Amino acid sequence: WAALLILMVIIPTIGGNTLVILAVSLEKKLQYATNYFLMSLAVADLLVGLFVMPIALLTIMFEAMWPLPLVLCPAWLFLDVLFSTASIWHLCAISVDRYIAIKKPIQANQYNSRATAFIKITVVWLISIGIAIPVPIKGIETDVDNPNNITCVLTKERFGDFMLFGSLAAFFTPLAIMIVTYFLTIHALQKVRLLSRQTISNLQRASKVLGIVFFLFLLMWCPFFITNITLVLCDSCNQTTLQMLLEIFVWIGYVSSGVNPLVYTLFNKTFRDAFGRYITCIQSSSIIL
Amino acid sequence: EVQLQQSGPELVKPGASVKLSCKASGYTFTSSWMHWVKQRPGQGLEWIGNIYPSNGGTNYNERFKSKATLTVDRSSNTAYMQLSSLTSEDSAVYFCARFGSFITTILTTYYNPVDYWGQGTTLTVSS
Amino acid sequence: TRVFKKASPNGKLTVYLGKRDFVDHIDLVDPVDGVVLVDPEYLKERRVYVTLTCAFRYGREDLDVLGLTFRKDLFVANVQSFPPAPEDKKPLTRLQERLIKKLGEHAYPFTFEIPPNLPCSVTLQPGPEDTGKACGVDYEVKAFCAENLEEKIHKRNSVRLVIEKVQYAPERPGPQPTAETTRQFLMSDKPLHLEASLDKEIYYHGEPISVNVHVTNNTNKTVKKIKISVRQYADICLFNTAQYKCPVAMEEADDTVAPSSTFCKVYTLTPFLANNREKRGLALDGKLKHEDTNLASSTLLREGANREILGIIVSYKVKVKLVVSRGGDVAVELPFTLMHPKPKEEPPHREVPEN
Amino acid sequence: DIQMTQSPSSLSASVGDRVTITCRASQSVSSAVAWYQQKPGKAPKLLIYSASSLYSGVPSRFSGSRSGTDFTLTISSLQPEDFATYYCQQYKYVPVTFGQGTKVEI
Amino acid sequence: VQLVESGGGLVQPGGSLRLSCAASGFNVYSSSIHWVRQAPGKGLRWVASISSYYGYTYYADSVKGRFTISADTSKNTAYLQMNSLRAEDTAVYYCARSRQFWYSGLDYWGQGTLVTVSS
Amino acid sequence: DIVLIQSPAIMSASPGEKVTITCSASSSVSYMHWFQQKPGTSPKLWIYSTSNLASGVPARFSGSGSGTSYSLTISRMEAEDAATYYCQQRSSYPLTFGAGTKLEIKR
Ligand SMILES: CCN(CC)C(=O)[C@@H]1C=C2c3cccc4[nH]cc(c34)C[C@H]2N(C)C1
Ligand SMILES: *[C@@H]1O[C@H](CO)[C@@H](O)[C@H](O)[C@H]1NC(C)=O
Secondary structure (H helix, E strand, O other): OHHHHHHHHHHHHHHHHHHHHHHHHHOOOOOOOOHHHHHHHHHHHHHHHHHHHHHHHHHHHOOOOOOOOOOHHHHHHHHHHHHHHHHHHHHHHHHHHHHHHHHOHHHHHHHOOHHHHHHHHHHHHHHHHHHHOHHHHOOEEEOOOOHHHOOOOOOHHHHHHHHHHHHHHHHHHHHHHHHHHHHHHHHHHHHHHHHOOOOHHHHHHHHHHHHHHHHHHHHHHHHHHHHHHHHHHOOOOOHHHHHHHHHHHHHHHHHHHHHHHHHHHHOOHHHHHHHHHHHHOOOOOOEEO | OOEEEEOOOEEEOOOOOEEEEEEEEOOOOOOOOEEEEEEOOOOOEEEEEEEOOOOOOEEEOHHHOOOEEEEEEOOOOEEEEEEOOOOOOOOOEEEEEEOOEEEEOOOOEEEEOOOEEOOOEEEEEOO | OEEEEEEOOOOOOEEEEOOOEEEEOOOOEOOEEEEEEOOOOOOOOOEEEEEEEEEEEEOOHHHHHOOOOEEEEEEEEEEEEEOOOOOOOOOOOHHHHHHHHHOOOOEEEEEEOOOOOOOOOEEEOOOOOOOOOOOEEEEEEEEEEEOOOOOOOOHHHEEEEEEEEEOOOOOOOOOOOEEEEEEEOOOOOOEEEEEEEEOOOEEOOOOOEEEEEEEEEOOOOOEEEEEEEEEEEEEEEOOOEEEEEEEEEEEEEOOOEOOOEEEEEEEEEOOOOOOOOOOOOOEEOOOOOOOOOOEOOOOOOOOOOOOOOOOEEEEEEEEEEEEEOOOOEEEEEEEEEEOOOOOOOOOOOOOOOEO | OOOEEEEOOEEEOOOOOOEEEEEEEOOOOOOOEEEEEEOOOOOOEEEEEOOOEEOOOOOOOEEEEEEOOEEEEEEOOOOHHHOOEEEEEEOOEOOOEEOOOEEEEO | OEEEEEOOOOOOOOOOEEEEEEEEOOOHHHEEEEEEEEOOOOOEEEEEEEEOOOOEEEEOOOOOOOEEEEEEOOOOEEEEEEOOOOOOOOEEEEEEEEEOOOOOOOOEEOOOEEEOOOO | OOOEEEEOOEEEOOOOOOEEEEEEEOOOOOOEEEEEEOOOOOOEEEEEOOOEEOOOOOOOEEEEEEOOEEEEEEOOOOOOOOOEEEEEEOOOOOOEEOOOEEEEOOO
16 A cells, blocks of 8 residues: 555655754754755755655545645645755755865865855755746646646646756756766876875775765656656657656655755764764873983 | 638438547647537537547546547647447537636636637438 | 883883974974883894874865875884894984983884974864864874884884974064055056054064054045054965965054045054964964964075975965055055074973863 | 972071971972962062072072972071071962961071 | 052952952063962962963852953953952952963062951 | 526517526536527627626626626617527536527517
């Protein structure tokens, strides 16, 4: 039965994000410039897990009809787009920051500050809102006014240009940046290790970790957008078959949001040290000649 | 100038099947639904079904599920309705029509009128 | 007299050293000599080795989230104490001979020489997040026991001590700093002229700096404000070459100079560490283990030539700025020196009434 | 906190004699002590710091020595100007602690 | 060269009293300021201390929470504010100066003031 | 299903008169639409959204509505207004039409 299986995926997202938010906000040992960006990412994932997935599950449970009043549909679409775009751009920004830190270590420490974190947060959220704004302006078109007998979805005829350009802007532009940054960072690591007698293993292990982290993003978010572009740009292709695949593929992108916080929080030692502390709650001498 | 054209009168024997066509002109033809209606001589109107051209989605009336079939051709710009197993009761005028729609933004919802009815065609069954 | 001794965790190896601060004259550096006491019964056939190392370390908690730590070596030296090298033929200092006479025959000496041009000991301010080790140049002396040098050493047979390399103020005072500047605006009516000076060159830690300012304005403008600041410059070479600047003391005066007028004033400033805790990357003198230390002192170099093989280089400057309302600014900089005087007794290496 | 014990409390000496005063500490204060002299009705004056160094301008008759945790002050030749009270202070740890003080009488 | 102490005790049975000291020839950022109390028929004691370079103030256990120490750079003065006096706090007070780099001893002393607390 | 009942079936009105026609519903609906048909001609939209006149309709006609009650009235009757009127709803499937009301002249 689908309900219990989906609920045991809905719950971990909320739990994991809430733990991170509480931990960051509570203790001063974890309060500094970098952690605020992770707080923003946790907020985005929590808002994804709180509003979108329950309503999507409700629409799956019924015969794809719309139970809530009619006016609420454009708001739901707008929230979905906004939250997903915000999460993706947060991941891209984290990757770029990591590369800049590795390339020049001393400059990064001086430039890093609280004001820079605020500026970055504001920029990312402004981009997400600007991308997601146009959807409620052009409302959906329906044959009847009864909510019980219609279905909420972005039809090709009304939103073809928006789907094409939003797919290009939301996903592929970050993808190119991550792809180039990975190679640049790995190349930097190899040359740096070339010059500077026992730190080789650490650099190699870090390179492996970065590769795995990149693969996780690519695998989770690629098929849905590939299918969406194919559906838009292929007239000969059968629409029903593509829609059946798309409805399945959206859920992997949804699960990515729950998966994301663990990778970034668990490897960090300070979080585990604070958890342990809260759960709990040779010498140079002398001689006279 | 939106125009709809239909085939001429038909006389068919009892126990046969025949298709009727509706050809559109003056608009996209893939952004609006097509409805089919039947009017008996000196009687009220009845609703048969509607079809959405781009993906072929259809909705049917319960009383006419067995009798009627709906199809479309995008390149030729034609809509077809097929009737099978005809009886004496089924002899009336048939209309293909395009109806208005409702647009709902986040503030309000409103209806835009684009209704236009093509002239019907007569079908008779006799032996 | 006092001698500093340390023992290995197992306790077989003990190292005696005379002092922890070695003065760096420009031409030459004090030798590093000492004694090591060993137990022959425990040593079947292994040897005792002594190593001096100068290292540049930089670790970040953000990097430490991954497996990242940066360390580079600038100077390495090695010596074999026991068994004694066959050549021997090395003179001994008086303290070494006294130590050997007091101890038994098992004690053996060691000596190191440092070349002239190497960086001094400097650390960088950690900041609230960093709570691990330190960042900057460090000097260490380590004695271990090994059958061969290539073999991996263990904690049981190793002793580690930290030493320092410092500099003190020169005896002869330098000349008096001064500076002069003239500026012409868009219309060639008249120039604006600014002159600034300091009291003297060499300043000790915690002493006031007096700046004399003399301005004359003959243009059709208005001077809104005057700003006096003291700035630290640090040059670092770790995988890159870079410069870094920080203001340490500031002062803002709202004195207005009318057209066709003159103005003269004297200002006083002091650089200190009480209000510079939040600034990150500030340079400091250098710590043995986690104690407060003053601001970093100037680095003295041989004037004829320079070769960039050094980690961190520190210097200071004083800036005077006039703000012009209609348009533009005027600025002037002067150089000075900030160092300790020579002490009669060795500095304490901790808080003296320590809490 | 460290408790410092000083002896002898009171002594009488004639001109030209040599006198010794001793002090002891519960823990090792690591050679960081100072000796002060106070005449009646006036503030104290520093005499010896670092347990061996003699303050500038002090006559060389005064000497200080350390052995273990025992610190001793010695005056070789006594003069009429050398009758006062003498205090011993340690400053390795906070709070700093003074001794009882001993009186020299003619 | 000289430390001048003022604000003598005004025979306060209970309340607040402010003692001030003025220094000549000393820079506050290069020295540490200490207060030393001497009771009648007793040895010296330690009361409070301040260092301005790092910005630190230390008090004794007995007077913690009732005494405060501060210094002002503009006028080169040091203040001790005393609250909730008792019968035990009757003594002669002294102000003393040390060296910041590095500590040797209390080398310059003040003249001292008399403070008396009576019923 | 939503069943619509239209009254009266046949009515007579002399030129220069005001008349009304009623359409009732089985269940509550939001809005109702009205069509007019002449003999030998396909029907044409006449009033939509329960009050608004379609383009070309004169000013005489008017509409009134509420939940399970709707009506169409004319200010002054004229000779050119003899035809058949239908009321439909566009709320939920399947769509339904009224029986129809026929208007005649009286002399
Ligand atoms: C199955 C139907 N749904 C849900 C109602 C979608 O297709 C959503 C439509 C999205 C969408 C369309 C067009 C452009 C875009 N950029 C970013 C997204 C996006 C997000 C994307 N969400 C995740 C799914
Ligand atoms: C349309 O909605 C009505 C509301 O009661 C419902 O009865 C009807 O079955 C719906 N049409 C469907 C499900 O085709």
